[PDB]
Design a binder for this molecule. Structure first.
Ligand SMILES: Nc1ncnc2c1ncn2[C@@H]1O[C@H](COP(=O)(O)OP(=O)(O)NP(=O)(O)O)[C@@H](O)[C@H]1O
Ligand SMILES: [Mg+2]
Length: 420
RNA sequence: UUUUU
């Protein structure tokens, strides 16, 4: 496919991001928990966290005034050479929480850039999230000698291998296409001093564990390396599995682990399978701009997108059955307003940061409450408000009624009797 | 099922 190359104009490099909301201040009212031995103190300002000036400059140009709770706790820990497990609600700044200190460390204590040997490997559960992280990295490393780069499936192995063999300090990647570059020995980890697993709980779950074990357990892995794990959810059982790959690690949690973001007004409707589509148009007809509808299957996303567009709703979709180029273009169109409605499977439930997403609709409830938390988290980020509407079907979503209630109470939302 | 060479 050969995806479009990223521009270098500071106007584009800094076009990605959401402006802090009116509730930004509410962040410090959130309880903080830290566990571990001699954990460095939390920094209170970007200009007092031992960050290289280049980095701080890019932060100011990115529009940040105050670090968020996880950034305050995470930055000093990473800067200290410590391993980290960080939990913080969706849209609360976790990406910068690990890029700033890592990027800063690359300039502060430089090592020669070898070929096919990255100094930082950041892994992602989805392709679009990989490129998003990739662009934030370019944003924070803007106007420096640092070379980023990204590797992910659905693209021509040649154009990526190309960009990489020019040498990259930081490599963002999805598991599959990385194990490919690795089994073909074009990529090796002798110089990898930072291994970051974004959406870590997902990277370590049944789906990805084997591939993830192989990556981190590779015979080529530099014995001395920091391992950082971040996520808005982290089931205890997965936190135990993570520990095997962490050394004397610090644990930080802002708020309730796996807790939903309190800035998203959540509403749950009791709808039956065949009553869902009219309800959807009912809602979209009332207001359709900036809405993402989450469905259960790939075929379902495509069917619904086609339906909606035949009814005068500028709609596009994203899921695994579309060409990688269509997946990227669909996000493009949603970001610049071309498309007003985005239909998606959980391929877009985690980490995506889209300014236009003003409403999240769970057309189909997910089977796991954690997936619910990430999905509604695509809205109401950075202290801003947001709404999430979910269609609860008694015919099949009884199993998640219990966890949904807890998440609802836990985020200060109202619980409808039918869930009880 | 959804992701993931
Ligand atoms: N300190 C800050 N001040 C203002 N805005 C920020 C700040 N830090 C990050 N942001 C922005 O807010 C959005 C949320 O950051 P992001 O790193 O995607 O959060 P998250 O915690 O990773 N979310 P999720 O991946 O859904 O759990 C991004 O647009 C950032 O640009
Ligand atoms: Mg994230």
């Amino acid at each position: 496919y050969i995806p479009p190359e990223p521009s270098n104009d500071a106007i584009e490099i800094f076009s990605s991001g959401i402006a802090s909301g009116i509730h930004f201040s509410k962040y410090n009212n959130i309880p903080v928990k830290v566990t571990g031995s001699d954990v460095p103190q939390p920094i209170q300002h970007f200009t007092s966290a031992d960050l290289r000036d280049i980095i701080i400059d890019n932060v100011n140009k990115s529009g940040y005034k105050i670090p968020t709770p996880i950034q305050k706790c995470s930055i000093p820990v990473i800067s200290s050479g410590r391993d980290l497990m960080a939990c913080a609600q969706t849209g609360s700044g976790k990406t910068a929480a690990f890029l700033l200190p890592i990027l800063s460390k690359l300039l502060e204590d430089p090592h020669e850039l070898e070929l096919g040997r990255p100094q930082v490997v950041i892994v992602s559960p989805t392709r679009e999230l990989a490129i998003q992280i990739f662009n934030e990295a370019r944003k924070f490393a803007f106007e420096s000698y640092l070379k980023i780069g990204i590797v992910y499936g659905g693209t021509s192995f040649r154009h990526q291998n190309e960009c990489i063999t020019r040498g990259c300090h930081v490599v963002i990647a999805t598991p599959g296409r990385l194990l490919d570059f690795v089994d073909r020995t074009f990529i090796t980890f002798e110089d990898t001093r930072f291994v970051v697993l974004d959406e870590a709980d997902r990277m370590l779950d049944m789906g990805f564990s084997e591939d993830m074990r192989r990556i981190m357990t590779h015979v080529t892995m530099r014995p001395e390396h920091q391992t950082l794990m971040f996520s808005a959810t982290f089931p205890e059982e997965i936190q135990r599995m993570a520990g095997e790959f962490l050394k004397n690690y610090v644990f930080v949690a802002i708020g309730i682990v796996g807790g939903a973001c309190s800035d998203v007004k959540q509403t749950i409707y009791e709808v039956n399978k065949y009553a869902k589509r009219s309800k959807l148009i009912e809602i979209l007809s009332e207001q359709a701009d900036g809405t993402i509808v989450f469905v259960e299957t790939k075929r379902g996303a495509d069917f619904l997108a086609s339906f909606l567009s035949e009814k005068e709703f500028p709609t596009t979709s994203i899921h695994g059955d579309r060409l990688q180029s269509q997946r990227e273009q669909a996000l493009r169109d949603f970001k610049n307003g071309s498309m007003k409605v985005l239909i998606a499977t959980s391929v877009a439930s985690r980490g995506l940061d889209i300014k236009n997403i003003k409403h999240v609709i769970n057309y189909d409830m997910p089977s796991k409450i954690d997936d619910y938390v990430h999905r509604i988290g695509r809205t109401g980020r950075v202290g801003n408000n947001g709404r999430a509407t979910s269609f609860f079907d008694p015919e099949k979503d009884r199993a998640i009624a219990a966890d949904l209630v807890k998440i609802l109470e836990g985020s200060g939302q109202t619980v409808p009797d039918f869930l009880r």
